[PDB]
Design a protein around this nucleic acid. Sequence first.
DNA 1: GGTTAGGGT
Length: 138
Amino acid sequence: SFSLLSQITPHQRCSFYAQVIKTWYSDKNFTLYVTDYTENELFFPMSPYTSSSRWRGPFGRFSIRCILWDEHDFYCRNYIKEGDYVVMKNVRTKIDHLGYLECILHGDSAKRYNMSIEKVDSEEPELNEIKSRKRLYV
DNA sequence: GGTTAGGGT
């Protein structure tokens, strides 16, 4: 079953719809920052004051970083783009060294977990709440 | 696995 991002808690498998705000690829992994415009007390508070940054929002604790390893990296890195919507299913969350929630997709997860990330066509009606909530923060 | 909310690869 799906959860709003405000409803996810560390160390539990979860599923959610989100919009991709930022991507970053590296030699090690592929990184997404995603939001559904709901607030979570463990997300990192993104600052509007950063001297140099291409982040335009949302600010505060409204987005979660996802680290994609191995097949998840190879699959998404030249596919998922900023502005896309995604559906992430049965993904795990952890707490990093500084105490912030993060979502991780580890390589070769058991088929039984049915863990996945897929792009959602932007015209899909399940994305309506995201688009509506976005209006509160622009 | 990686380090810390940038960079813009």
